[PDB]
Design an enzyme around this catalytic site. Structure first.
Site, PDB file in Angstrom:
ATOM      1  N   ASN A   7       0.810  -1.236   0.000  1.00  8.89           N
ATOM      2  CA  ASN A   7       0.000   0.000   0.000  1.00  8.89           C
ATOM      3  C   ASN A   7       0.852   1.301   0.000  1.00  8.89           C
ATOM      4  OD1 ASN A   7      -1.863  -1.780   2.463  1.00  8.89           O
ATOM      5  ND2 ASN A   7      -2.382  -1.661   0.296  1.00  8.89           N
ATOM      6  N   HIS A  46       3.090   2.264   2.196  1.00 14.46           N
ATOM      7  CA  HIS A  46       3.353   2.723   3.557  1.00 14.46           C
ATOM      8  C   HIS A  46       4.643   2.031   4.021  1.00 14.46           C
ATOM      9  CE1 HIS A  46      -0.430   4.749   4.667  1.00 14.46           C
ATOM     10  NE2 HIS A  46      -0.822   4.171   3.539  1.00 14.46           N
ATOM     11  N   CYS A  86       6.197   7.184   9.469  1.00 12.36           N
ATOM     12  CA  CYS A  86       7.236   7.873   8.714  1.00 12.36           C
ATOM     13  C   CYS A  86       6.747   7.804   7.256  1.00 12.36           C
ATOM     14  CB  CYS A  86       8.594   7.195   8.885  1.00 12.36           C
ATOM     15  SG  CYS A  86       9.859   7.731   7.694  1.00 12.36           S
TER      16      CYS A  86
END
Ligand code: A1BM3
Ligand code: A1BM3
Lengths: 269, 268
Positions: A190, A192, A227
């Site tokens: 995804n 991330h 992050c």
């Protein structure tokens, strides 16, 4: 991999790969964390969660909700060597409106002995606003179908390490590794940052002499903020202690915004 | 995994993992490269090489020699999806005194169709002085026992992509990603930077819009010098065109070349 006979837990075996091991030819704690995530993912798919990358229930998709990690806690007694087969059993439990928990037990496939254990806390998040929330009645009801209804804990003990409060490291740090950035291999499907990357970044500020003479026994990590792909991180470490103990802090390189805090316990080889 | 019936090649199957895939839910080229390395290690162990981290023959240990990668070339037709089973066949060949070659064929376990192929060139290096060497008669003799003696090539074609000369990128680069550093997960069991990390670093300077709209079809990488644990790398890329790029990895400070390569991408 497969669900166990009662359909309330999942088991999967893995052969430790050549690139998965460190200098002592045994699996790194990051390899262990990746295997935990893999068997977790296979368990969720087996019990009917979505296969689009965000692992959701029917009620979660309708309400635009996703699970996010709040804490990860791993205790290793023996790291499997290169070529060994490790068997991992996993299961989930509802924790009222707070969130959910996923637990794991690692075993040596040959001896049948427990070589590690792990536990993780997950909290509900609205996928659009990124705001945390409580677990609703419909989601608690969905969890009754595939979770044991009597308590089953990887860490049963009274005031065990998995539930300890972690303090915030105060400047100056004893050790640091600055300018840490994620590359594409650090991202999940995804886009991330993978939760295991944060473990590697925490560990980056441990001096190489500790890694050469000690084995990591326990790691507890709190996840506060994510992050982003274009963010830069500073990893900070201070000794708090035979056994060596450290306090850790990951923060954004610029403004010092906290992303993670944790503790590690190491034993002399 | 296991040696084939004739004992001259090795096969192994892998189920693609959740963390091994990118945004289109198929294996990354780095996942593919890791699987190639894994099946290569298993093949070397099955034919009697050392199990101490440096895959060596008896003559190599006596002469303090190790194999080092000179070039990696991978061509993918279809990336296996998350949960798919991919079967990889690998074999080696002696190339006189020059070095050795390892080849791979990737197949879909269900259809049996070839979904990719790869080839790599390895050169002898003295482990102590780090000086390149030729392959001696005793090492060529050791390779006769487990390599096919008639040519077997993953890339047979005359003047194929795996054998092309790669030019050096000239400044200014069209794109760049600077300050790339390895962390412990980038190191192998011998504390050297894993050869697959260099692939990831090369790819870091490809713009995200190319990655979002195109599929990587071919990558050829030359390895010139190793990046140490405390080194910092700059990844440079310039379009030479299907989209084609020229790549250069160099040390952040003095500009010492570590790798050069080329990639070919097809619109999705
Ligand atoms: C986000 C989904 N993952 C990661 C694979 C879990 O481990 C998990 C969390 C909560 N509930 C369940 C059934 N699974
Ligand atoms: C360095 C050893 N590796 C990596 C596992 C090889 O692929 C290889 C190279 C040369 N010869 C053989 C039999 N194997």
């Amino acid at each position: 991999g497969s669900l166990t006979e009662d359909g309330l837990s999942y088991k999967e075996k893995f052969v430790v790969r050549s690139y998965e091991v460190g200098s002592n030819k045994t699996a790194t704690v990051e390899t262990i964390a990746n295997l935990l995530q893999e068997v977790g993912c296979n368990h969720a798919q087996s019990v009917g969660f979505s296969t689009d990358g965000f692992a959701t229930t029917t009620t979660m998709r309708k309400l635009h909700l996703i699970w996010v990690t709040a804490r990860m806690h791993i205790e290793i007694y023996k790291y499997p060597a290169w070529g060994d087969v490790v068997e991992i059993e996993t299961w989930c439990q509802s924790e009222g409106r707070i969130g959910t928990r996923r637990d794991w037990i690692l075993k040596d496939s040959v001896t049948g002995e427990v070589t590690g254990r792990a536990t993780s806390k997950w909290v509900m998040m609205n996928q659009d606003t990124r705001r945390l929330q409580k677990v609703s009645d419909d989601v608690r009801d969905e969890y009754l179908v595939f979770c044991p209804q009597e308590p089953r804990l990887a860490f049963p003990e009274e005031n065990n390490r998995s539930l300890k409060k972690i303090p915030k490291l105060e400047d100056p740090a004893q050790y640091s590794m600055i300018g840490l950035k994620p590359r594409r291999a650090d991202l999940d499907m995804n886009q991330h940052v993978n939760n295991v990357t944060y473990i590697g970044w925490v560990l980056e500020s441990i001096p190489q002499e500790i890694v050469d003479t000690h084995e990591l026994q326990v790691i507890t990590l709190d996840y506060r903020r994510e992050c982003q792909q274009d963010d830069v991180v500073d990893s900070l470490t201070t000794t708090t202690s035979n056994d060596s103990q450290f306090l850790h802090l990951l923060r954004l390189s610029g403004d010092g915004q906290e992303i993670n805090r944790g503790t590690t316990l190491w034993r002399k080889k």
